[PDB]
Design a protein around this ligand. Structure first.
Ligand SMILES: NS(=O)(=O)c1cccc(F)c1F
Ligand SMILES: NS(=O)(=O)c1cccc(F)c1F
Ligand SMILES: OC[C@H]1O[C@@H](O)[C@H](O)[C@@H](O)[C@@H]1O
Ligand SMILES: OC[C@H]1O[C@H](O)[C@H](O)[C@@H](O)[C@@H]1O
Ligand SMILES: [Zn+2]
Length: 257
Protein backbone atom coordinates (compact mmCIF):
# COMPACT_ATOMS: atom_id res chain seq x y z
CA UNK A 1 0.00 0.00 0.00
CA UNK A 2 0.89 3.64 -0.31
CA UNK A 3 3.29 5.40 2.03
CA UNK A 4 6.12 7.94 2.05
CA UNK A 5 9.21 5.77 1.44
CA UNK A 6 11.30 5.46 -1.70
CA UNK A 7 9.30 2.47 -2.91
CA UNK A 8 5.72 3.58 -2.14
CA UNK A 9 5.92 7.36 -1.78
CA UNK A 10 4.62 10.41 -3.68
CA UNK A 11 6.44 9.57 -6.94
CA UNK A 12 4.67 6.18 -7.12
CA UNK A 13 1.12 7.19 -6.12
CA UNK A 14 -0.03 7.97 -9.68
CA UNK A 15 0.08 4.26 -10.64
CA UNK A 16 -2.86 3.46 -8.33
CA UNK A 17 -4.34 7.01 -8.09
CA UNK A 18 -4.01 8.57 -11.57
CA UNK A 19 -5.60 11.83 -10.34
CA UNK A 20 -2.15 12.43 -8.77
CA UNK A 21 -1.33 14.12 -12.12
CA UNK A 22 -4.64 16.04 -12.19
CA UNK A 23 -5.55 19.68 -12.70
CA UNK A 24 -6.08 20.77 -9.06
CA UNK A 25 -3.61 18.80 -6.92
CA UNK A 26 -2.27 19.85 -3.52
CA UNK A 27 -0.07 21.01 -1.90
CA UNK A 28 1.32 23.95 -3.93
CA UNK A 29 3.97 26.60 -3.46
CA UNK A 30 2.38 29.90 -2.37
CA UNK A 31 4.10 32.72 -4.29
CA UNK A 32 3.28 35.62 -1.97
CA UNK A 33 4.03 38.26 -4.61
CA UNK A 34 1.63 36.74 -7.18
CA UNK A 35 -1.17 36.06 -4.66
CA UNK A 36 -3.82 38.79 -4.96
CA UNK A 37 -6.13 40.38 -2.37
CA UNK A 38 -9.72 39.25 -3.02
CA UNK A 39 -12.44 41.68 -1.84
CA UNK A 40 -15.20 39.12 -2.44
CA UNK A 41 -13.92 37.03 0.50
CA UNK A 42 -16.24 37.32 3.51
CA UNK A 43 -14.96 37.32 7.10
CA UNK A 44 -13.64 33.87 8.14
CA UNK A 45 -15.36 32.24 11.13
CA UNK A 46 -13.64 29.46 13.09
CA UNK A 47 -16.22 28.36 15.70
CA UNK A 48 -14.67 25.63 17.87
CA UNK A 49 -16.06 26.51 21.35
CA UNK A 50 -18.31 23.41 21.42
CA UNK A 51 -15.88 20.95 19.82
CA UNK A 52 -16.07 17.36 21.09
CA UNK A 53 -12.83 15.43 20.59
CA UNK A 54 -13.07 11.66 20.97
CA UNK A 55 -9.97 9.62 20.12
CA UNK A 56 -6.42 9.74 18.73
CA UNK A 57 -5.37 7.09 16.17
CA UNK A 58 -2.02 6.14 14.59
CA UNK A 59 -3.18 5.23 11.06
CA UNK A 60 0.27 4.22 9.78
CA UNK A 61 0.71 7.55 7.93
CA UNK A 62 0.20 10.17 10.67
CA UNK A 63 -1.99 10.43 13.77
CA UNK A 64 -5.58 11.70 13.61
CA UNK A 65 -7.39 13.46 16.46
CA UNK A 66 -11.04 12.63 15.76
CA UNK A 67 -14.15 14.68 16.60
CA UNK A 68 -17.84 13.94 17.08
CA UNK A 69 -19.20 15.22 13.74
CA UNK A 70 -22.79 13.98 14.23
CA UNK A 71 -23.87 17.63 14.78
CA UNK A 72 -22.51 21.14 14.13
CA UNK A 73 -20.48 21.91 16.89
CA UNK A 74 -17.32 22.72 15.58
CA UNK A 75 -17.66 24.51 12.26
CA UNK A 76 -15.80 26.65 9.73
CA UNK A 77 -17.76 29.27 7.78
CA UNK A 78 -17.11 32.43 5.82
CA UNK A 79 -14.03 33.42 3.84
CA UNK A 80 -14.26 31.65 0.47
CA UNK A 81 -16.82 29.15 1.76
CA UNK A 82 -20.47 28.84 0.74
CA UNK A 83 -22.22 27.19 3.68
CA UNK A 84 -21.14 25.33 6.82
CA UNK A 85 -18.23 22.88 7.13
CA UNK A 86 -18.01 20.55 10.13
CA UNK A 87 -14.71 19.52 11.78
CA UNK A 88 -14.06 15.75 11.51
CA UNK A 89 -10.37 15.41 12.41
CA UNK A 90 -6.97 17.06 12.53
CA UNK A 91 -3.50 15.67 11.81
CA UNK A 92 0.03 16.88 11.01
CA UNK A 93 2.79 16.40 8.43
CA UNK A 94 6.40 16.73 9.61
CA UNK A 95 10.04 16.14 8.74
CA UNK A 96 13.07 14.19 9.91
CA UNK A 97 14.75 17.56 10.68
CA UNK A 98 13.42 21.09 11.26
CA UNK A 99 14.28 22.29 7.71
CA UNK A 100 11.49 20.29 6.05
CA UNK A 101 8.10 18.81 6.87
CA UNK A 102 5.44 21.19 5.54
CA UNK A 103 3.39 20.35 2.46
CA UNK A 104 2.60 23.88 1.35
CA UNK A 105 5.62 26.16 0.96
CA UNK A 106 5.78 29.97 1.10
CA UNK A 107 8.04 31.46 -1.60
CA UNK A 108 9.59 27.93 -1.70
CA UNK A 109 10.37 27.99 2.06
CA UNK A 110 9.62 24.74 3.88
CA UNK A 111 8.40 24.83 7.51
CA UNK A 112 9.14 22.14 10.12
CA UNK A 113 5.54 20.85 10.05
CA UNK A 114 1.98 21.61 8.97
CA UNK A 115 -1.33 21.10 10.82
CA UNK A 116 -4.49 20.23 8.82
CA UNK A 117 -7.96 20.69 10.36
CA UNK A 118 -10.31 18.77 8.02
CA UNK A 119 -13.97 19.81 7.58
CA UNK A 120 -16.81 18.56 5.38
CA UNK A 121 -19.68 20.51 3.80
CA UNK A 122 -22.89 19.73 5.68
CA UNK A 123 -25.08 20.15 2.59
CA UNK A 124 -23.83 16.68 1.52
CA UNK A 125 -24.84 14.88 4.74
CA UNK A 126 -21.70 12.69 5.32
CA UNK A 127 -17.95 12.84 4.66
CA UNK A 128 -18.23 10.02 2.10
CA UNK A 129 -20.74 11.94 -0.03
CA UNK A 130 -18.76 15.17 0.45
CA UNK A 131 -15.70 13.58 -1.23
CA UNK A 132 -17.79 13.09 -4.39
CA UNK A 133 -18.27 16.87 -4.70
CA UNK A 134 -16.01 19.69 -5.98
CA UNK A 135 -16.79 21.76 -2.84
CA UNK A 136 -17.05 18.86 -0.39
CA UNK A 137 -14.16 19.69 1.96
CA UNK A 138 -12.39 22.66 3.54
CA UNK A 139 -8.96 22.17 5.12
CA UNK A 140 -7.51 24.84 7.43
CA UNK A 141 -3.71 24.59 7.19
CA UNK A 142 -1.33 26.06 9.80
CA UNK A 143 2.47 26.09 9.56
CA UNK A 144 4.70 25.08 12.49
CA UNK A 145 8.13 26.59 13.13
CA UNK A 146 10.49 25.60 15.95
CA UNK A 147 11.00 28.09 18.78
CA UNK A 148 8.93 28.51 21.95
CA UNK A 149 6.65 25.68 23.07
CA UNK A 150 2.95 25.71 22.10
CA UNK A 151 1.08 25.01 25.37
CA UNK A 152 -2.08 23.85 23.56
CA UNK A 153 -0.09 21.14 21.75
CA UNK A 154 1.40 19.51 24.85
CA UNK A 155 -1.59 17.22 25.58
CA UNK A 156 -1.16 15.79 22.07
CA UNK A 157 2.58 15.27 22.54
CA UNK A 158 2.14 13.53 25.86
CA UNK A 159 -0.28 10.87 24.55
CA UNK A 160 1.91 9.82 21.60
CA UNK A 161 3.81 7.20 23.67
CA UNK A 162 0.51 5.28 23.92
CA UNK A 163 -0.09 5.17 20.15
CA UNK A 164 3.45 4.45 18.93
CA UNK A 165 2.54 1.93 16.23
CA UNK A 166 0.06 1.62 13.36
CA UNK A 167 -3.43 0.68 14.47
CA UNK A 168 -3.14 1.86 18.06
CA UNK A 169 -5.64 4.36 19.44
CA UNK A 170 -6.34 6.08 22.75
CA UNK A 171 -9.15 8.08 24.34
CA UNK A 172 -8.66 11.78 23.60
CA UNK A 173 -11.74 13.49 25.02
CA UNK A 174 -11.94 17.11 26.21
CA UNK A 175 -9.23 18.50 23.91
CA UNK A 176 -9.69 22.13 22.77
CA UNK A 177 -8.36 22.69 19.20
CA UNK A 178 -8.55 26.48 19.70
CA UNK A 179 -5.18 26.17 21.45
CA UNK A 180 -3.50 25.19 18.14
CA UNK A 181 -4.28 28.44 16.30
CA UNK A 182 -2.03 31.52 15.84
CA UNK A 183 -3.23 35.01 16.77
CA UNK A 184 -4.03 36.16 13.22
CA UNK A 185 -6.52 34.64 10.80
CA UNK A 186 -4.94 36.24 7.71
CA UNK A 187 -4.91 33.53 5.01
CA UNK A 188 -4.35 32.43 1.45
CA UNK A 189 -6.95 30.27 -0.36
CA UNK A 190 -7.14 28.18 -3.53
CA UNK A 191 -8.99 25.07 -4.86
CA UNK A 192 -7.12 21.78 -4.49
CA UNK A 193 -7.13 18.17 -3.35
CA UNK A 194 -6.41 15.77 -0.54
CA UNK A 195 -2.61 15.55 -0.15
CA UNK A 196 -2.85 11.80 0.62
CA UNK A 197 -4.27 8.99 -1.53
CA UNK A 198 -6.95 8.93 -2.84
CA UNK A 199 -5.93 12.54 -3.77
CA UNK A 200 -9.55 13.55 -4.47
CA UNK A 201 -10.09 17.04 -5.90
CA UNK A 202 -12.67 18.18 -3.34
CA UNK A 203 -10.87 20.70 -1.13
CA UNK A 204 -11.05 24.45 -0.61
CA UNK A 205 -7.66 25.12 1.03
CA UNK A 206 -7.38 27.94 3.61
CA UNK A 207 -3.72 28.32 4.65
CA UNK A 208 -2.98 30.74 7.51
CA UNK A 209 -0.12 33.19 6.97
CA UNK A 210 1.05 33.27 10.62
CA UNK A 211 2.89 30.11 11.75
CA UNK A 212 2.58 28.74 15.25
CA UNK A 213 5.75 28.15 17.26
CA UNK A 214 6.36 24.74 18.83
CA UNK A 215 9.42 23.65 20.79
CA UNK A 216 12.13 21.35 19.50
CA UNK A 217 11.15 18.87 22.22
CA UNK A 218 7.54 18.82 20.97
CA UNK A 219 8.43 18.03 17.36
CA UNK A 220 11.09 15.50 18.44
CA UNK A 221 8.27 13.50 20.06
CA UNK A 222 6.33 13.45 16.76
CA UNK A 223 9.45 11.85 15.26
CA UNK A 224 9.39 8.97 17.78
CA UNK A 225 6.15 7.58 16.32
CA UNK A 226 6.33 4.54 14.03
CA UNK A 227 4.88 3.84 10.58
CA UNK A 228 5.02 0.08 11.33
CA UNK A 229 2.75 -2.04 13.50
CA UNK A 230 3.53 -3.55 16.88
CA UNK A 231 6.25 -6.17 16.77
CA UNK A 232 7.52 -5.19 13.34
CA UNK A 233 10.92 -3.60 12.58
CA UNK A 234 10.96 0.05 13.60
CA UNK A 235 10.42 2.63 10.83
CA UNK A 236 10.27 6.09 12.34
CA UNK A 237 7.25 8.17 11.26
CA UNK A 238 9.09 11.10 9.66
CA UNK A 239 8.90 12.91 6.31
CA UNK A 240 5.19 12.16 5.90
CA UNK A 241 4.70 15.10 3.50
CA UNK A 242 3.89 15.34 -0.22
CA UNK A 243 5.95 17.95 -2.14
CA UNK A 244 4.43 20.89 -3.99
CA UNK A 245 2.49 20.08 -7.16
CA UNK A 246 1.95 22.13 -10.36
CA UNK A 247 -0.35 25.14 -9.93
CA UNK A 248 -1.83 24.76 -13.43
CA UNK A 249 -4.95 26.90 -14.09
CA UNK A 250 -5.28 28.34 -10.58
CA UNK A 251 -4.84 31.60 -8.66
CA UNK A 252 -4.07 31.96 -4.97
CA UNK A 253 -6.16 34.67 -3.28
CA UNK A 254 -5.22 36.56 -0.12
CA UNK A 255 -7.60 37.70 2.63
CA UNK A 256 -5.40 40.69 3.46
CA UNK A 257 -4.48 43.82 1.55
N1 LIG B 1 0.97 3.33 -6.13
S1 LIG B 1 1.20 3.06 -4.56
O1 LIG B 1 2.18 4.00 -4.08
O2 LIG B 1 -0.08 2.96 -3.95
C1 LIG B 1 1.95 1.45 -4.43
C2 LIG B 1 1.29 0.47 -3.70
C3 LIG B 1 1.85 -0.79 -3.54
C4 LIG B 1 3.08 -1.10 -4.11
C5 LIG B 1 3.72 -0.13 -4.84
F1 LIG B 1 4.92 -0.40 -5.41
C6 LIG B 1 3.18 1.12 -5.01
F2 LIG B 1 3.85 2.00 -5.76
N1 LIG C 1 -3.82 15.92 4.12
S1 LIG C 1 -5.31 16.42 3.88
O1 LIG C 1 -5.69 17.39 4.88
O2 LIG C 1 -5.52 16.74 2.51
C1 LIG C 1 -6.37 15.04 4.22
C2 LIG C 1 -5.85 13.80 4.61
C3 LIG C 1 -6.70 12.75 4.91
C4 LIG C 1 -8.08 12.90 4.84
C5 LIG C 1 -8.58 14.13 4.46
F1 LIG C 1 -9.91 14.30 4.33
C6 LIG C 1 -7.74 15.16 4.19
F2 LIG C 1 -8.31 16.35 3.84
O1 LIG D 1 -10.13 39.86 -16.00
C1 LIG D 1 -9.61 40.45 -14.81
C2 LIG D 1 -9.68 39.46 -13.67
O2 LIG D 1 -8.71 38.43 -13.96
C3 LIG D 1 -8.77 37.35 -13.04
O3 LIG D 1 -7.81 36.42 -13.42
C4 LIG D 1 -8.49 37.83 -11.61
O4 LIG D 1 -8.71 36.77 -10.69
C5 LIG D 1 -9.41 38.98 -11.23
O5 LIG D 1 -9.06 39.50 -9.94
C6 LIG D 1 -9.39 40.06 -12.30
O6 LIG D 1 -10.36 41.06 -12.01
O1 LIG E 1 -7.72 16.38 26.21
C1 LIG E 1 -7.03 15.23 25.72
C2 LIG E 1 -6.46 14.39 26.84
O2 LIG E 1 -5.51 15.20 27.56
C3 LIG E 1 -4.82 14.47 28.56
O3 LIG E 1 -4.26 13.32 28.00
C4 LIG E 1 -5.81 14.03 29.62
O4 LIG E 1 -5.12 13.30 30.63
C5 LIG E 1 -6.91 13.18 29.00
O5 LIG E 1 -7.93 12.93 29.96
C6 LIG E 1 -7.53 13.88 27.80
O6 LIG E 1 -8.36 12.97 27.10
ZN1 LIG F 1 -2.89 16.58 5.73
Amino acid sequence: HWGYGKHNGPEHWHKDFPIAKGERQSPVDIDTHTAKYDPSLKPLSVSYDQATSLRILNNGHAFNVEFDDSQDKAVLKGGPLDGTYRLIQFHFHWGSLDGQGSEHTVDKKKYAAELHLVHWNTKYGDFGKAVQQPDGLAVLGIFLKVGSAKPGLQKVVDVLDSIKTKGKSADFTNFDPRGLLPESLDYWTYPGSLTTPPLLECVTWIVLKEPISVSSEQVLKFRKLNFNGEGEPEELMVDNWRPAQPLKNRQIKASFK
